Structures are given as C-alpha cells and as structure tokens.
Amino acid sequence: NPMEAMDPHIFYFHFKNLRKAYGRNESWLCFTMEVVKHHSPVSWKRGVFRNRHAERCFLSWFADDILSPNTNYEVTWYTSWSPCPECAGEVAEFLARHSNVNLTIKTARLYYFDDTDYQEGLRSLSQEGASVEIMGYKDFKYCWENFVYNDDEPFKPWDGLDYNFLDLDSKLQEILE
Numbered sequence: 073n074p075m076e077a078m079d080p081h082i083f084y085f086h087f088k089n090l091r092k093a094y095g096r097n098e099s100w101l102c103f104t105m106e107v108v109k110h111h112s113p114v115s116w117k118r119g120v121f122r123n124r125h126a127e128r129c130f131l132s133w134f135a136d137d138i139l140s141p142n143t144n145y146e147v148t149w150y151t152s153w154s155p156c157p158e159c160a161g162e163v164a165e166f167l168a169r170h171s172n173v174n175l176t177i178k179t180a181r182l183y184y185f186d187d188t189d190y191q192e193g194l195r196s197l198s199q200e201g202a203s204v205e206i207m208g209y210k211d212f213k214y215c216w217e218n219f220v221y222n223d224d225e226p227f228k229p230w231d232g233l234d235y236n237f238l239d240l241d242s243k244l245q246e247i248l249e
Contacts, residue, residue, distance in 0.1 A: 073133045074103075074119030083220045086152045087180045087212060089236040094184055099153045101126040102219040106146040107138075120219055126151070127159040131166055145173045150207060150215050154179040160193030167200045176203040178211050182240055191247045198248050206240045209233060 078100065086093070086100045101121045108114050117138075121129040130149070139145075155163060155177070167173060177197070183190040198204050207215075209229060216227040 073129065073137075074121055076119060077219055077221050078102075078120050078122075080220055080222060080225075083216065084230070087207075087215065088230055089180050089207075089240065090230065090232055093152075093181065096152065099123045099126040099151065101130055101152075102150040102215055103130060104148045104218075105138075108144040108146065109140070110142045118218065125156065125159045127155055127163055131162065139170070143172065147173060148176045149178065150211060150219070151177060151179045152181065154182045154190075154204075155193060155197065156183075157187070157189040157193040160190075160197045163202070164193075164196045164200045167197075167202060174201070176205070178205045178207045180207045180212075182206075182243060186243075194244075194247055204244065204248065206237055206244055208237045 082100075086096055086098060099122070103117075103119060103121070105117045106114055107117065121133075123129070124132075163175070167175060194204055212229065212233070213227045216222050
C-alpha cells in the first residue's frame with residue numbers, strides 16, 4: 073500500500089513552505105520506521121503515502137500489516153501538511169493506546185486556517201507524546217535523498233525556504249507553549 077518514492081516534480085510541488093503551496097489539497101506522508109522486537113535485530117522500513125487522509129492510510133497499513141506483540145516502534149513522519157483536526161485526533165488516540173509506538177512528526181506547512189480546533193489537535197498530539205516540528209533544510213534534503221526519485225541530482229532549495237521555516241517555527245512554539 074505504501075509507495076517507495078515519489079516523483080521529483082511532485083516533491084517540489086507539494087513540500088514547498090511558500091504561500092502558493094497552501095492551495096495544495098493533497099497531503100503527502102513520508103515515513104521511516106525502526107522495528108525493535110525484543111531479543112532480535114532491528115529492522116527498518118520506509119515509504120510514502122498520499123491521501124482517507126494520508127495519516128489514516130499509514131495507521132491502517134501499520135495496524136493491519138505491521139503491528140505485532142513484543143515489539144517497540146520508532147516512527148518518523150515527514151508531511152506536506154500538518155495533521156488536520158480530525159487527523160490529529162485519530163493519531164493522538166492511537167498513540168494513547170499503543171505506548172510501544174513513538175512518533176515524531178515533521179511538517180512542511182502548518183494549516184490553511186489558524187483555527188482553534190487545529191491548534192488543539194496539535195497540542196493534543198503533543199500531549200500524548202508525539203514530537204511535532206517544522207521541516208527545515210536538513211529535513212527537506214533527507215526527504216529528497218530518501219523518498220524521491222532524485223536521479224542523483226542534488227536538492228535545490230527554493231527561495232524563502234529558511235525564512236518561512238523561522239515564521240512557521242515561531243507559530244508552532246506559540247501553539248505548543
């Protein structure tokens with residue numbers, strides 16, 4: 073159900089943190105996962121989901137095909153959009169019930185509206201132990217190298233990538249603090 077990588081034009085189109093990209097209705101989710109079964113070697117998985125929100129696609133695949141007893145999980149998501157209010161509520165409840173799953177979420181953009189419900193979704197996710205962060209240069213470069221058919225070309229950042237990170241990280245710390 074998860075793709076191995078996305079097309080380079082699709083990456084630059086959906087993971088931009090500029091205002092133009094706020095019209096993008098699709099939500100892309102790249103993930104890395106360390107699977108840590110007790111007294112076994114660690115195994116790794118990675119892949120890509122697109123929106124059933126991309127979040128629900130990941131959790132449905134995770135729960136049905138991956139989750140197993142006596143196993144801890146270290147999961148990182150790289151998302152084009154931050155989780156919508158309902159999205160965030162599902163993930164928050166999932167994590168409350170699976171303490172063996174640890175989740176870090178890095179997002180390219182926050183939300184289309186600065187609604188109270190979206191803020192509370194993130195706070196609630198953060199409350200249940202998820203780490204919520206904005207994607208910076210290093211995270212976009214990681215995704216380019218690992219989740220995109222980059223064809224061996226270096227990542228080329230877009231104008232304003234770093235300025236917009238500062239603005240988003242500022243907004244996010246005000247939500248979470």
